[PDB]
Design a protein around this ligand. Structure first.
Ligand code: CDL
Ligand code: SF4
Ligand code: SF4
Ligand code: SF4
Ligand code: SF4
Ligand code: FES
Ligand code: MG
Ligand code: ZN
Lengths: 114, 208, 112, 96, 176, 230, 97, 124
């Protein structure tokens, strides 16, 4: 069934837009670290950008990819315009949450979670 | 006299019905349905891509000068294929009337931005996007308006939890506010209030 | 003749009759390109010829405003301009065609 | 009628009292435990029984519209007194 | 009907022009404002001498909460949970069971005063006038937990404020 | 073969012997009831289900009246509404003011059907009837002032549980439901009289005063106490 | 209010108004804080007869909206949503400030 | 108008955490009629609700605490197909329960007075 495309027509143009947004985020991490006075490294920021891009690597719908890059542009322009604070930028890193157990034995020990 | 029953206005009902027929005749390509509620409110259901032509007609037509955009919101009905229902409320000062125009969309289908018809549509559509996830194609500045920076999810959706997924506190170790998964000292006690006896026979649906 | 229209940004027009005649003639010219059987064309042609007839029969501005019941003469001129722009857009849109697509089976049902 | 638990902690009218090994007693150190001394059960037991010569009586709690909803108590069981359960008030028919 | 707030034009006669020029050069309206402030200076202040003087209140005032008793000493509350059902902010938690004498009485009656919106719905829905909003409003605390009232605290409030609560309910009960 | 009846003018084919209540159920209209239970025999005494047939001058008990060919059932007619209002008026005229102290509370058929089919005001300027309470065991608590004499418990007891110790003693307004002797209705199916009683006359004694219906969350599981798998 | 005659004259001269006519402090001119008991009216539906809820039920008279036009399903004059709003009249009380 | 030969999946867009997307099994069903009432107006629409998680006791005030965002979330659907479609596009696991309607029953008031059958009642 034919559907109205948000952008990108097929998957190739969606991948192109993903690459453009990835370049935009990659060239912004030094500025983000400088302006927000982050105690993280530039390499850490670039790795976090790569990780956040990689968790959506299983998407096979061009419209979902277009919406994802739209929201990525939104949260990039929040970082560039310093609308965000260091609070949110470091919320990206989950620096205060305790490491959740992942093995069956530990999960059995701690509680009733699946 | 019936002091406890709202009086009705057949004159206004007939006028609204006539104008609904008028607009439906003028715009057959987009108008799907026309209704007049028993408390005299005209409601127009159109195709989602007729938003700009229908709104421009209702604004600029001599016999329909709805020069004011009273409101613009959406309603989430998950049981429908197109869960989101965009609603426009227009006010015509020249004829002292109000009209409602309703369209539909889902998560992955954009709706044309009506900032070229009404300037209030800018912030109204920003709020619609922020609270439901509906994308508006040609919007001068489409971004979050009400939620926190970096907030994930659209909270007015029916499937979004009332308390969300994260909560904020100040952590002394990191010397900043932190966001952590929501944890409630007292859980919101959900109540089942609906009576198992039908209240309004006029609205009874066929068993099907 | 009057000092102001009372509305901010709405200037007074010294030649209301001629401007209204020009605008109505242009509107009628645009409507000739719309199909004869179009429901939009009939109604707006009717109302335009009704209003164009009033401006050609009443030389007094105050009585013309009373007869048109469209506010002040500057408001009538602005509404004529809006109608002309709408006629051009509808000529481009062509909304007299049959319905684009019927909605899904249960799209306007309520309550549900 | 307040009563003292074996740990020296007052027992409320609901029977609440922390156990000896319960750590939650630490909240009362250098502070106090809020216990209401008046016991409604004891006071309503102190209240007497009204003798009325009718099979059915009515109780609204006294005060009319300032009391509780008016209810009717059937005083036919001669082995016990009929208790209005809004206000716990006992009524009885004259025996002997 | 309508009126124009500002659509008047000034007369251009010589006397009026000279008057306006005198107002411009000699700051007449500014002196008038000074005179108004001086008048208010010489008026009597509207300040009350708190805490020795209190602002007026009414019998309907909604302040601190209280659980009431019947004149016999029995608690009015019957664990019906109407106040809990009607509470907008879900500030009330109620748990009940049959008592020793079989009465329908509560065992837990908590009100979170940091969650309550002091809307008075609980005392409207009570059919026995058990839960009320007393006249007290000066009950600010130094710790958050002290504002999490429980059944014992509410019963103590009722016993403490019973006279004034009863007087206010007597005064205002015919309007309800 | 099926016969054609009409509910509010809508055609419906029903088997012979079908009742007006079942025809309305087929077309999706649930007629109000207090004594009718589909698992029990037909009593027809509460009179709450009276409906109007199109040409019949008299209302019929929908729970006991078999439909005839070409019957038009006016469920939302003026006569039907007035009949429901009158029956509810009698019921609440003799009912006690026990709702807050009553465990039936927000899951009561008397309250819901009074809010949906009855009037909002009372014309009863007399005194009410108070009934002595019986004792039928440690499981079912009896407050018989709330009984509406619908004989659901009697019919269930006898027919389903095979125990014939429930019934009506006396007659008139003084008619009472009970054993007439100090006998405990002890059976393996004793709580279903708590379930089927529309009012708070029969309530669960272990569950007394503990909760209210709107608070509770419902988890749909099965039973393990036996091998039936209820 | 309690003030000297000279101070009242100074206040009136400075402000240009007789302040004692319109005082902003309340001096025994307000209602007593204790009032006699009321007796409020009942209403129109407090009858004992000819008062059935089926004849005075507002919620049960509500209807689903009428479907004027549905796609699924002479020279007509053009119509408007309503008659044009009449021109307002200038205030007779005080047309201009 | 592009053509996509893919299933709808908006999990990356909804903003739900991965834990509450993967480890959640919703229950699509029509609620059972409340046995305390004879009404059947609450057994007409399908419901979608999540699995019960842990609830513990607050050390202060003894309240009921939770750490599960979706404890109170119940969705209403007009059709089993609609509910299944919503669950599939939102990526949660789902268990479907077929609707249980009462079977038709033959009733007769005249059976209470049978001449030779056991349906004759001993009381009225
Ligand atoms: C320079 C002015 C000197 C005179 C002066 O202050 O007169 C105040 C006096 C205040 O008059 P008011 O405002 O009508 O008095 C308020 C009421 O009468 C209500 O007045 P009251 O009954 O409250 O008076 C209490 C009394 C006593 O009050 C006190 O002792 C409190 C103030 C002590 C101040 C030190 O006040 C005075 O004695 C006021 C004069 C204090 C002089 C110091 O002014 C005059 O008598 C006219 C002055 C005209 C000036 C032009
Ligand atoms: S005043 Fe309102 S918010 Fe406060 S406890 Fe009462 S009902 Fe709840
Ligand atoms: S409404 Fe009154 S009687 Fe009912 S639970 Fe609340 S305080 Fe108790
Ligand atoms: S049985 Fe129903 S109507 Fe009667 S007191 Fe209980 S809740 Fe109220
Ligand atoms: S006790 Fe209940 S089930 Fe039995 S007759 Fe009375 S109302 Fe009906
Ligand atoms: S349900 Fe038919 S008379 Fe009772
Ligand atoms: Mg029961
Ligand atoms: Zn009493």
């Amino acid at each position: 069934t034919s559907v109205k495309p948000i952008f990108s027509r097929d998957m190739n143009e969606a991948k192109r837009r993903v690459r453009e947004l990835y370049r935009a985020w990659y060239r912004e991490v030094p500025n983000t670290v400088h302006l927000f006075q982050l105690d993280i490294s530039v390499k850490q920021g670039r790795d976090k950008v790569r990780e956040m891009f990689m968790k959506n690597a299983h998407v096979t719908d061009p419209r979902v990819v277009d919406l994802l890059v739209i929201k990525g542009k939104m949260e990039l322009e929040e970082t560039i315009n310093v609308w965000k604070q260091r609070t949110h930028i470091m919320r990206f890193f989950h620096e205060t949450e305790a490491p959740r157990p992942t093995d069956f034995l530990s999960k059995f020990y701690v509680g009733h979670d699946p | 006299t019936r002091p406890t029953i709202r009086p009705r206005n057949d004159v206004v009902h007939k006028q609204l019905s006539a104008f609904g027929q008028y607009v439906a005749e003028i715009l057959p390509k987009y108008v799907q349905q026309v209704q007049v509620s028993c408390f005299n409110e005209l409601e127009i259901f159109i195709h989602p891509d007729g938003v700009i032509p229908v709104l421009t007609f209702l604004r600029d037509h001599t016999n329909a000068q709805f020069k004011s955009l009273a409101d613009l919101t959406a309603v989430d009905v998950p049981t429908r294929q197109n869960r989101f229902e965009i609603v426009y409320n227009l006010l015509s000062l020249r004829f002292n009337s109000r009209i409602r125009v309703k369209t539909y969309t889902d998560e992955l289908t954009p709706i044309e931005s009506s900032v070229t018809v009404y300037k209030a549509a800018n912030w109204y559509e920003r709020e619609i996007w922020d609270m439901f996830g509906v994308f508006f194609a040609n919007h001068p500045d489409l971004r979050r308006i009400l939620t926190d920076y970096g907030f994930e999810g659209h909270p007015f959706r029916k499937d979004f939890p009332l308390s969300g997924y994260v909560e904020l506190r100040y952590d002394d170790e990191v010397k900043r506010v932190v966001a952590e998964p929501v944890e409630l000292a007292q859980e919101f006690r959900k109540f089942d209030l609906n009576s198992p006896w039908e209240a309004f026979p006029a609205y009874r649906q066929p068993p099907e | 003749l009057k000092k102001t229209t009372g509305l901010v940004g709405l200037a007074v027009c010294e030649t209301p009759h001629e401007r209204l005649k020009i605008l109505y003639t242009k509107i009628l010219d645009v409507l000739g390109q719309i199909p004869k059987n179009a429901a939009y064309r009939k109604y707006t042609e009717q109302i335009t010829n009704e209003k164009l007839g009033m401006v050609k029969a009443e030389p007094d501005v105050k009585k013309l405003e009373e007869q048109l019941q469209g506010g002040q003469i500057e408001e009538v001129i602005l509404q004529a301009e809006n109608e002309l722009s709408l006629a051009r857009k509808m000529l481009r849109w062509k909304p007299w065609e049959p319905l684009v697509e019927e909605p899904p089976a249960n799209q306007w049902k309520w309550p549900i | 009628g307040v009563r003292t638990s074996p740990t020296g902690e007052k027992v409320t009218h609901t029977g609440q009292a922390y156990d000896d090994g319960d750590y939650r007693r630490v909240r009362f150190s250098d502070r106090q435990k809020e216990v209401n001394e008046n016991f409604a059960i004891d006071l309503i037991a102190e209240q007497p029984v009204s003798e009325v010569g009718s099979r059915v009586i009515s109780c609204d709690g006294g005060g009319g519209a300032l009391g509780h909803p008016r209810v009717y108590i059937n005083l036919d069981k001669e082995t016990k007194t009929g208790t209005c359960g809004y206000c716990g008030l006992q009524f009885r028919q004259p025996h002997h | 009907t309508y009126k124009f707030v500002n659509m008047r034009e000034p007369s251009m006669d010589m006397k009026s022009v000279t008057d306006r020029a005198a107002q411009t050069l000699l700051w007449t309206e500014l002196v008038r404002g000074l005179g108004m402030t001086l008048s208010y200076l010489f008026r009597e202040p509207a300040t009350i001498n708190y805490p020795f003087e209190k602002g007026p209140l009414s019998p309907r005032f909604r302040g601190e909460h209280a659980l009431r008793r019947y004149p016999s000493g029995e608690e009015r509350c019957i664990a019906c949970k109407l106040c809990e059902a009607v509470c907008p902010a879900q500030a009330i938690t109620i748990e009940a069971e049959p008592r020793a004498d079989g009465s329908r009485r509560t065992t837990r009656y908590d009100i979170d005063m940091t969650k309550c919106i002091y809307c008075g719905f609980c005392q409207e829905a009570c059919p026995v006038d058990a839960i009320v909003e007393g006249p007290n409003f000066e009950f600010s605390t130094e710790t958050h937990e002290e504002l999490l009232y429980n059944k014992e605290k509410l019963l103590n409030n009722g016993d403490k404020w019973e006279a004034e609560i009863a007087a206010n309910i007597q005064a205002d009960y015919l309007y309800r | 073969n099926l016969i054609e009846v009409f509910v509010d003018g809508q055609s419906v084919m029903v088997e012979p012997g079908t009742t007006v209540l079942q025809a309305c159920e087929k077309v999706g209209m649930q007629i109000p009831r207090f004594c009718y239970h589909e698992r029990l025999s037909v009593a027809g005494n509460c009179r709450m289900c009276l409906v109007e047939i199109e040409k019949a001058p008299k209302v019929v008990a929908a729970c006991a009246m078999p439909v005839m060919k070409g019957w038009n059932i006016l469920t939302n007619s003026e006569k039907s509404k007035k009949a429901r209002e009158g029956v509810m008026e009698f019921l609440l005229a003799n009912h006690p003011l026990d709702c807050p102290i009553c465990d039936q509370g927000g899951e009561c058929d008397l309250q819901d059907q009074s809010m949906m089919f009855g009037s909002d005001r009372s014309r009863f300027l007399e005194g009410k009837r108070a009934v002595e309470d019986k004792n039928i065991g440690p499981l079912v608590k009896t407050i018989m002032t709330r009984c509406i004499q619908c004989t659901r418990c009697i019919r269930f007891a006898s027919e389903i549980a095979g125990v014939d110790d429930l019934g009506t003693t006396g007659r008139g307004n003084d008619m009472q439901v009970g054993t007439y002797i100090e006998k405990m209705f002890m059976s393996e199916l004793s709580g279903n009289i708590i379930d089927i009683c529309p009012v708070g006359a029969l309530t669960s004694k272990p569950y007394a005063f503990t909760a209210r219906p709107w608070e509770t969350r419902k988890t749909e599981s099965i039973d393990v106490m036996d091998a039936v798998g209820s | 209010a309690s003030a000297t005659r000279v101070i009242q004259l100074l206040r009136n001269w400075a402000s240009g108004r007789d302040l004692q006519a319109k005082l902003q402090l309340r001096y025994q001119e307000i209602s007593k804080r204790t009032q006699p008991p009321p007796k409020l009216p009942v209403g129109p539906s407090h009858k004992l007869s000819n008062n059935y809820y089926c004849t005075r039920d507002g919620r049960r008279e509500a209807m689903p909206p009428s479907i004027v036009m549905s796609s699924q399903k002479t020279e007509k004059k053009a119509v408007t949503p309503a008659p044009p709003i009449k021109r307002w009249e200038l205030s007779k009380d005080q047309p201009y400030l | 108008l592009i053509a996509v030969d893919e299933k709808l999946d908006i999990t990356t867009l909804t903003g739900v955490p991965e834990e509450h997307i993967k480890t959640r099994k919703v229950r699509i069903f029509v609620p059972a009629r409340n046995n305390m009432q004879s009404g059947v107006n609450n057994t007409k629409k399908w419901k979608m609700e999540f699995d019960t998680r842990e609830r513990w006791e607050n050390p202060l005030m003894g309240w009921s605490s939770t750490a599960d965002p979706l404890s109170n979330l119940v969705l209403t659907f007009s059709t089993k197909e609609d509910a299944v479609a919503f669950a599939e596009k939102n990526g949660w696991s789902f268990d479907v329960e077929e609707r249980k309607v009462p079977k038709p029953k033959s009733k007769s008031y005249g059976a209470n007075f049978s001449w030779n059958k056991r349906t004759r009642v001993s009381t009225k």
